[PDB]
Amino acid sequence: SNPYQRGPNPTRSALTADGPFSVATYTVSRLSVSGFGGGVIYYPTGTSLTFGGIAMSPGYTADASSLAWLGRRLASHGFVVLVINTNSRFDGPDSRASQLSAALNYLRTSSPSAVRARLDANRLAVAGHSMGGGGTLRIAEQNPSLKAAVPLTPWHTDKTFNTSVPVLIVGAEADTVAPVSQYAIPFYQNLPSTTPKVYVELCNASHIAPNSNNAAISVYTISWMKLWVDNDTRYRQFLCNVNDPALCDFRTNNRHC
Numbered sequence: 001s002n003p004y005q006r007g008p009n010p011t012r013s014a015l016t017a018d019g020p021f022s023v024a025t026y027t028v029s030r031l032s033v034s035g036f037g038g039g040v041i042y043y044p045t046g047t048s049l050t051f052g053g054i055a056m057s058p059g060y061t062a063d064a065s066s067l068a069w070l071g072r073r074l075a076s077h078g079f080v081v082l083v084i085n086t087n088s089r090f091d092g093p094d095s096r097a098s099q100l101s102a103a104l105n106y107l108r109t110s111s112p113s114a115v116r117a118r119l120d121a122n123r124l125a126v127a128g129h130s131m132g133g134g135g136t137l138r139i140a141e142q143n144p145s146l147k148a149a150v151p152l153t154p155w156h157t158d159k160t161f162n163t164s165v166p167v168l169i170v171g172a173e174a175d176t177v178a179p180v181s182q183y184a185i186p187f188y189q190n191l192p193s194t195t196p197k198v199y200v201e202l203c204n205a206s207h208i209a210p211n212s213n214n215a216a217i218s219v220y221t222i223s224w225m226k227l228w229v230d231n232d233t234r235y236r237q238f239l240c241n242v243n244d245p246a247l248c249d250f251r252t253n254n255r256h257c
């Protein structure tokens with residue numbers, strides 16, 4: 001049996017709402033940490049188990065609140081999640097990668113005792129929005145110890161990331177900021193053919209789709225994190241044989257099926 005498996009058997013409906021774990025938060029002040037701008041930790045409560053960790057970056061001009069719904073959503077399905085604020089709201093994608101690295105170090109070492117007590121530091125992942133998704137791609141390339149990476153409507157001027165970390169990219173069909181033809185799709189195509197990878201494109205969605213409750217983002221992000229952070233094969237069903245009415249594209253090399 002899988003020692004990292006958490007929660008009841010999933011249904012698709014259950015992955016579109018907060019999950020079976022209650023969630024608490026801890027606010028990490030900007031002045032209290034080195035290498036990033038603080039943020040908010042979301043973590044499961046009412047449980048004696050340990051969970052994988054996820055660090056998430058917002059995009060240009062944005063703060064951690066722009067991903068609060070998703071940090072809480074992931075935590076409620078069984079993850080310790082640190083959504084960062086950046087040193088400057090104007091930091092670029094590679095800077096955001098460096099800050100995600102600093103945030104993962106903080107999460108493992110200097111976060112509250114209660115957070116470390118429910119964190120399995122051996123199982124970590126990253127996600128992020130826009131330039132924060134660019135940072136997710138870069139840290140995945142720099143840090144093959146990561147279990148998974150989920151760039152959401154990502155933006156970066158570099159298009160090729162030589163990473164072995166399994167990547168699921170969410171593109172937005174109606175994105176006029178990081179259009180999928182110039183950003184998300186090239187990122188997917190240029191990843192190594194040997195790295196497990198998925199691209200999903202949300203029909204009719206804008207660049208700010210990741211900043212509020214979104215059923216498809218919830219399903220695909222939870223499932224990819226579950227499959228790779230927890231080795232939880234019960235989530236393969238949502239990532240294989242896909243026929244999703246909300247998607248206008250789906251690409252994969254089918255290394256996870």
Ligand SMILES: [Ca+2]
Nearest residue numbers: 030033036037
């Ligand atoms: Ca700081």
